[PDB]
Amino acid sequence: LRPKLSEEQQRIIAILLDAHHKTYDPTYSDFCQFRPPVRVNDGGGSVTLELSQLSMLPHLADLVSYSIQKVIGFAKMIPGFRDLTSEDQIVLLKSSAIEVIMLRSNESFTMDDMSWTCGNQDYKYRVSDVTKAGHSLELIEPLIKFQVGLKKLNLHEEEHVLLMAICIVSPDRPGVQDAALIEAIQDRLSNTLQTYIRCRHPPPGSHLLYAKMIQKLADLRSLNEEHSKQYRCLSFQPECSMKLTPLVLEVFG
Numbered sequence: 001l002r003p004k005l006s007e008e009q010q011r012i013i014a015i016l017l018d019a020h021h022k023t024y025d026p027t028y029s030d031f032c033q034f035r036p037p038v039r040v041n042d043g044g045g046s047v048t049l050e051l052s053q054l055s056m057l058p059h060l061a062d063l064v065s066y067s068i069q070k071v072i073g074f075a076k077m078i079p080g081f082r083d084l085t086s087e088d089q090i091v092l093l094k095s096s097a098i099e100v101i102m103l104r105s106n107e108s109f110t111m112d113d114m115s116w117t118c119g120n121q122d123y124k125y126r127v128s129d130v131t132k133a134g135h136s137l138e139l140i141e142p143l144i145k146f147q148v149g150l151k152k153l154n155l156h157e158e159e160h161v162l163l164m165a166i167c168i169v170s171p172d173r174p175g176v177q178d179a180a181l182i183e184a185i186q187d188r189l190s191n192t193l194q195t196y197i198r199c200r201h202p203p204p205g206s207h208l209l210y211a212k213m214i215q216k217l218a219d220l221r222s223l224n225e226e227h228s229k230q231y232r233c234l235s236f237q238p239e240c241s242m243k244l245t246p247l248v249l250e251v252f253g
């Protein structure tokens with residue numbers, strides 16, 4: 001059976017599309033306000049050199065910090081999010097922040113050359129730029145594989161925004177108090193997504209798409225864990241805090 005989207009489900013989708021359009025600038029016009037990207041010579045991918053310089057960290061830290069602010073704005077507009085306690089809202093945002101950034105970044109990722117292209121060549125980020133920020137291939141390679149996999153699903157914008165919302169409102173995050181309420185909120189979003197796919201998404205791949213999307217959420221958890229491990233290592237580097245931002249320090253600290 002392929003039941004039609006209820007008026008409420010249609011409303012949820014409209015609200016999320018609006019939230020995304022207000023919090024994701026497809027022109028990347030604010031990027032010139034971040035600390036400038038610096039790309040030193042490191043064809044050898046020397047960990048020692050990368051850690052001593054962290055040339056791309058200030059720029060990427062600003063980009064990530066800016067993104068967290070946009071994610072906070074998006075989350076506040078998710079139907080039901082405001083009904084949670086502030087304590088639970090913060091737990092959900094802090095635990096999902098890196099995952100939603102990875103998801104939303106798919107919009108600027110291009111399979112033409114496997115990079116995140118955000119306008120001019122100065123704002124084109126490749127694997128080599130991430131290593132210059134202190135991270136290693138143990139995170140980057142799986143990250144790129146994840147981006148290509150997500151890209152290949154060719155999600156409608158409606159599906160893309162529902163996925164980010166579902167990612168944020170997850171009941172199995174450590175520290176949440178009212179898991180039941182959170183689960184209820186997520187279920188409403190999941191049912192909307194499942195109904196949308198069967199009703200609005202044409203073949204091939206009509207079905208199975210939901211399963212593939214859910215698997216991506218599992219993939220994000222692993223990437224989250226690896227990023228946390230690497231962030232810890234990065235925090236050991238003297239004077240690193242100055243290259244980050246207060247928001248980044250709190251969310252990942």
Ligand SMILES: C[C@H](CC#CC(C)(C)O)[C@H]1CCC2/C(=C/C=C3C[C@@H](O)C[C@H](O)C3)CCC[C@@]21C
Pocket residue numbers: 057060061063064067101102104105106107108109116118125130133135227231248
């Ligand atoms: C591992 C990085 C995250 C980090 C970090 C620190 C340095 C804080 O550990 C990568 C996560 C995904 C990502 C990237 C995200 C890019 C997006 C630009 C635009 O799509 C708006 C998104 O909102 C942000 C590309 C360059 C490497 C990263 C910044």
